[PDB]
Structure 1
Amino acid sequence: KIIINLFAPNLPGSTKEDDLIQKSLRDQLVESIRNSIAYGRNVFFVDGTRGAGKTTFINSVVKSLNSDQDDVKVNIKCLPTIDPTKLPRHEPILVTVTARLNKMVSDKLKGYWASNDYRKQKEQWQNHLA
């Protein structure tokens, strides 16, 4: 049941469930990603011409994996989608990944309830960042 509302904004940000043109792909891509972790580089590619809806499709995959965090036995954490065109011209991708990964780790550090657990893992994270 895919119902496209033409008078809706119909933008990658505003696209939700039940009006995603690509839904069989989204369902099967998530399962393939999960199975590759349950069992080197593990890189998936989603191809398509310009305007095919890559940004709309890949955001749903991040949304699909983010939902039901603890419920799924295989746990995958998704960083926010990186857009190479909107990044600074000379800013490295490894810097972008770490900066987004650091915030995800940092917000988890602020979520602990044990002082020693938070204190010990904070310096380990800072040691690797250094």
Structure 2
Amino acid sequence: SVVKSLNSDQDDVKVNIKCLPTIDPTKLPRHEPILVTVTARLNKMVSDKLKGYWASNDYRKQKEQWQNHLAQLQRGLHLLTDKEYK
């Protein structure tokens, strides 16, 4: 109920809340870090909104920068689940 009252705002005030889809730890596939699931669901909202732009110059600038941060995270994701240092 509070999700539908925050993702369906009338754009009344500048401060805004964007709600990710509900995450269920039980139904989530095991041996998968929560941080990975959150980023995957966060990607869909940003990627779909990136597709929704109208200014071609703005879309190309953000896509280059946003895709750069994801490539930085995956390099460090090895450090999250390891059994030894190297």
TM tier relative to shorter chain: 0.7 to 0.9
State the 1:72 CA deviation.
3.4
Structure 1 residue runs of 4 or more that deviate by more than 4 Å after TM superposition: none
CA distance 1:98–1:64, shift in 2 (3 Å)? same
State the 1:69 CA deviation.
5.1
Q: What is the identity percentage for the equivalent residue pairs of Structure 1 and Structure 2?
A: 100
Distance 1:71 1:87 in 2: 35
Distance 2:57 2:29 in 1: 38
Distance 2:26 2:13 in 1: 33
Matched positions, count:
71
Per-residue CA deviations over 1:32-91 (Å, capped at 9, x if unaligned) read xxxxxxxxxxxxxxxxxxxxxxxxxxxx11111111152233211110010010101011
Query: How big is the alpha-carbon RMSD for the aligned residues of Structure 1 and Structure 2?
Result: 1.1
Unaligned runs of 5+ in 1: 1-59
The 8 Å contact of residues 69 and 75 in structure 1, kept in 2 or not, is answered as no
CA distance 1:126–1:116, shift in 2 (3 Å)? same
Partner of 2:47: 106
Distance 2:11 2:31 in 1: 37
* Normalised TM-score (structure 1): 0.52
* Normalised TM-score (structure 2): 0.77
Residues 35-50 of structure 1: matches in 2 within 5 Å? none
Distance 2:69 2:27 in 1: 27
State the 1:125 CA deviation.
0.9
